[PDB]
Every structure is written in C-alpha cells, then in structure tokens.
Structure prediction request, 770 residues.
Amino acid sequence: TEFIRFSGVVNPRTISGSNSVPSTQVADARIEYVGNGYINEAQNMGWLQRFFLNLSPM
Amino acid sequence: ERIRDLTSVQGVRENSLIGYGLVVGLDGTGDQTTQTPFTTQTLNNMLSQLGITV
Amino acid sequence: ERIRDLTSVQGVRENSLIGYGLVVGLDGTGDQTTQTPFTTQTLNNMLSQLGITVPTGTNMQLKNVAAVMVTASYPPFARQGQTIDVVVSSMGNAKSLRGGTLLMTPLKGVDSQVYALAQGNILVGGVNQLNGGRITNGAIIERELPTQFGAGNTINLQLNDEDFTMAQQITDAINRARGYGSATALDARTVQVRVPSGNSSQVRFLADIQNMEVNVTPQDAKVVINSRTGSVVMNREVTLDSCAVAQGNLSVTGGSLQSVRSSANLNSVVRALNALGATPMDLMSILQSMQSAGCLRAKLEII
Amino acid sequence: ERIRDLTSVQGVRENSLIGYGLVVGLDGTGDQTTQTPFTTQTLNNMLSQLGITVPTGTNMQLKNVAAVMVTASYPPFARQGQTIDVVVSSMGNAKSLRGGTLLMTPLKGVDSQVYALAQGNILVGGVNQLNGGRITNGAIIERELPTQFGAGNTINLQLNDEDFTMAQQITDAINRARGYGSATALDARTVQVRVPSGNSSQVRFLADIQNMEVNVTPQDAKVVINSRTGSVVMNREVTLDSCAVAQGNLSVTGGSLQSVRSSANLNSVVRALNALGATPMDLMSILQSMQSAGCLRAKLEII
Amino acid sequence: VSVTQQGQAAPVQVGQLNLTTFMNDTGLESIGENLYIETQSSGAPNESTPGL
Prediction:
C-alpha cells in the first residue's frame, strides 16, 4: 500500500479555470509519498548497519 | 468682492490626484493591445479579481 | 429649495458597483471569441453551472455573445428589493449590443462583495454609440449598508463649492429660521447643524432645512477654457483692464494693435472682446496672454 | 394613486430566473453546430432522455435547432400554476429565431433551484432584432418562496428616489389619513408604517395606503446628458446665471462671445440656450463648460 | 455534392444539383448577363436530377 499525502495553503487567485493549481504555488507545502509491505521493509537499513553508519569511526 | 480675487487663504489649497484605469465601451477605437501589453495585463488583473482566471 | 442644491448631507452618499457579464441575443455582432478567450471561458462556466459540460478540447466560435462590464450606482439608504439602472459596456472586439440581453450579473463593491444582481434588456440608441447601453431598473439591490444616521445630535452639511461667505450665509439662514444655535460653521465647506436625537426628528429637521432658500453671494471671477472642445465660458464677475492686443490676421476694423477698454461688468467685457473680431481659438490665446499681462482680472482655468 | 407610484412595499419584490434551452422549427436559420458543440451535445442529451441513443462518433450538422438562453422574472407572491413571460436569446452564430419553438426549459434561480418551466412559441418582430424574442405566459411557476408578510406590526415603504422632504410628506399624509402614529420616517428613503397583526388587515391597510395622493415637492435641479444617444434633458428646477459663452462656428446673430442672461425658470433657460443657436452635441460641451464655470445652477449627470 | 471532413472516413452528402430541361432550347430569351429565361415557345421548364 502506497500513500500520497499533501497539505498546504492556497491563494484563491492562483487557481486556474479548471480548478487546478501547481504545487509550487502552495505556501506551506507538505508532500509525502510512502509505502508499506515487504517492498518498503526491503528499503530499510538493518539495525546493525544503521548503528555502524552512525557510530563507526569512518 | 476684490480681496477674494486678489489673495488666497493660507491652508485653503488644492491638491492633485492621479490614477490608472480602463475605459470600455468603445466602437472599435480602443487600444491595439499588441503594442500596449499593460492594457491586457490590467484587464486580466481585473478579471482575476472578479473571479475569472484567463 | 436652494440649500438642497448647494450642499450634501453627511452620510447620505452614493457608492459605485462593478461586475462582469455576458450579453446574448445579438445579430452576429458579438465577440469573435478567438481574440477574446474569456467570453468562451465564462460561457463554459455558465453552462457547467447549469449542468452542461462542454469538453475542454473543442472549438467554439460564437457570434451572438459579447463579454461586457456592468457599472451601477449604489444609492443612499438602499434597501434589498429595490431596482437601479445599470450601464453595459463591451470589453473586446464586439461590433454592437443593439438587441442584446444581460444575463445574471453580480455587482461587486470596492470590498468585493455582491450588493446587487443585474439582468435585463439593453437599450442602445442606434453617430450613436453601439458598444454601450443602459438598462433602467436593471439591477436589484441585495445587500444593505449600515449607517449612523439618527445617532448623535450633529449633522454636517457639505458645500459643493468651498466658500467662507456661502458657509456663513447658510449658517445665518439656518439660525434665522430655526433658533439661535441651530447651525455653526466649521470651515469654508462644512456647516455643523444640531438636531434632536432620534430618526424621525432628524428627518423632519432635514426636510425643513433642505428646501430653505439662500441668496447666493458673488463667487470668484473665473474664465473656463476647454481647448479639447473649443469653448470659453466667463462668469458674471469677470472684468477687464485697458490694454493693447495684437494677434495674427487680426486688425482694427487698420493697424494690428487694437485697444481694449477698461470693463466693469460682463456686458462691457463681451463688447470689448467682440470688438476684436477673434475666433474662439484665437480668443483662447488672447485671454491667456491678457492673463499673463494682467488685463484679465479673473482666474483662468483650463479644463 | 401616487404613493403606489413613489414607493415599494418591503418584501414585495421581483427575482430573476435564468435557464438554457433549445429552439426548433427554424427555416435553416439555426446554429451551425460545428462552431457550437453544446447545441448538438444537449440535443443528444434530450434524445437520450427520450430513449434514443445516437452513437458518440457521428457527424450531426443541424440547421433548424438553436441553443438559446431564457430569462424570466419571478413575481411577488408567485404561486405554482401561474404563467409568466420569458425572453429567449440566441447564444452562438444563429441567424434568426423567427418561427421557432422553445422546448422544456427549467428556469433556475440564484440558488440554482428550478422555480419555473418554460415552453412555448417565440414571437419575433421581423431593423428588427432576429436573435431575440418574447413568449407571453411562456413559463409556468413550479416553486413558491416563503415570506414574512402578515407577521409583525411594521411594514416599510421604500422610496424610489431618496428625499427627506418626500419621506416627510408621505409620513404626514399617512398620519393625516389614518391616525396619529400610523407612519414614521427612518431615513431619506424608508417610511415605517404600523399595521394590525394578521394577513387580511395588512392587505386592507396597504390597499388604502397605495392609492393615496401625495403632492410631490420640488426635487434637485438636474441636467441629464446622454452622449451615446445624443440627448439632453433638463428638469423644471434648472436655473442659469449670466455669463459669456464662445464655441467654434457659433457667433452672435457677429462676435464669437455671446451673453447668456440670468434665468430663473425653465422657459427662460430654454430661451437663453436657444438664443445661442447650438447643436445638442455643441450644447453638451457648452453645458459642461458652464457647470465648470458656475453659470449652470444644476447637477450635471452624464448617463 | 459530397464533402469530405477531418476525422470522418465517410464523405457527407450536401445536396443534388438539378438541371432544367426545356423542349425547345432555341426559344429561351437571352436576358444578357449569361442568363436565359423561359418564353411562350419554350414553356414548362422540367427539373430533373442529371443522368435521367
């Protein structure tokens, strides 16, 4: 399952005639595109590898 | 009735006001709007203010 | 019936309303709609509102529809249900609005709020302007403005033209008619009037004040020159001083220098200036030169 | 029978209805339907509603069908089953609606609700407008509006033109006819009238009030100028002040400066202005210049 | 008279060009501007679709 979430503030005069506004005209734009399932877990680092990436000398 | 015609009262003065506008209802004798981009730009501004987005 | 013609009541004022609309029913004299995309866009908007969705990719070439701007005046103490006249003016490349009809048009104020709704049939003269028309009782009032009339014991009469003498005359007339301290003068343009608290009492007071007669004192001498229309207007206070005038192709009816006598009233001034035999366009230059020299004892205003 | 001609009753107002329809039966003077896709789209919609499904991919070139906009007025206290007149106006590239018939058209209000249904035969004059017509009793009322008439003991008469004197005159007439505290004035435009509680009693009160006679007091001096139609109208209150006027190709019947005498009534003003020998287009500029100078003691309104 | 359009494999029909046939073609009155009118010697102009 994939989730696309959007939030922001829109000026009414930036909305086009077809009730559309580009995402670059939204003030506090919060855009999120995430997923779950084993596909999403396959894109997470292992805990040991994350620990090393954060605490290894090099 | 001569002093009023020879002098002016201090503080009793006139100022000058200026502004920009659009004149509509002409019989094909308006701007060409190809050599005057501001006419179309301000018409679009007025339409957007009124709720129409060209 | 002169005070109502010389002053205006404070708070009793008119506002301006504007709006956008479409005019249909033209005989092929509407917008071309190829150089005016907003006409077709707003027609599609109206159709979508009414329940018809024209596909976005489609060529619409209309001939009986014109995009128009509607202007109206919001009257004092306007009430919902009342009707006002509107002016309808074409906006782009339309040829005529002779038999058109104005569809539902919301008339917005300066604050971008709807104060009236306009819909009706246009009357166009038909040398006559074809792209502009008027609709009597074409708009119905929908919103009402709050006002402070009837509150307090003071109301200001605002003179159309600033004059200390006229302000004092109006104040003295009101004091002579309705008691000692009924009216006072604040400046050359405003006269403050004391009225009883309430709504009906103030209406009665204003009804008595408005039709009062005031003798107008003589104003400032003024010569109004309109070069765009080619007109000159001189009021009754204009006088002349004796001096010589010369201008091209003008001569004594003889020499090119013509004497202008000292003139006290307007008839003498008119006689002296007509003795010059000057065309009004020549009279404009003559008057400006005389004002520069000092013969013209008047304020020369170019409008 | 003057109060009914000077005021309107609060809550007794007219609304505006709009709708879309198709007009059939034209003699090859309808839409081209190639530049107006909505005509064919709505014809297909109607056929589908009636049980005929034309395939989506098909070329339909009609000549006897025109897409039209229908406008109507919702009367006060309208009841379902009553008939009203409608105006039918072509919308795109149609040539004439001379013998057309308007099919079933729902007339929506501002709130996008159906208040009437329109169907009938168009009458077109046939110099005459061809793309606009009228159908008498062309629409049947289908919805009714709630109202507060008959509730409360107060009803407001709203003057067509704002005037403190006229408001006071109407109030005094009502008080002189129907008791001491029967009517009061709220502002220059509204007169509040006390009526008995109920529906029939208020109808009786309004019937007595409406046909009452009120002597109209003199209004403000006003000169109305219509440059689009080339007309000037001066009311009976216009006066003139003595001053000199000059304009192109106008001269004393002599010199270019012509005296204008001080005028008190309208006949004197008309005589003084006709002595100038001015065309109405010239009279417009003359009047504007005189208003600028101050000779014209009237409000100059350009409409 | 058939007319082809875009996005329409099938040509549309626009109408029939009918020819007028007289029984004495010598008898028409020449108006002038490349026009002939029926006279008493060539009455009854018979309209017909071409070919029949």
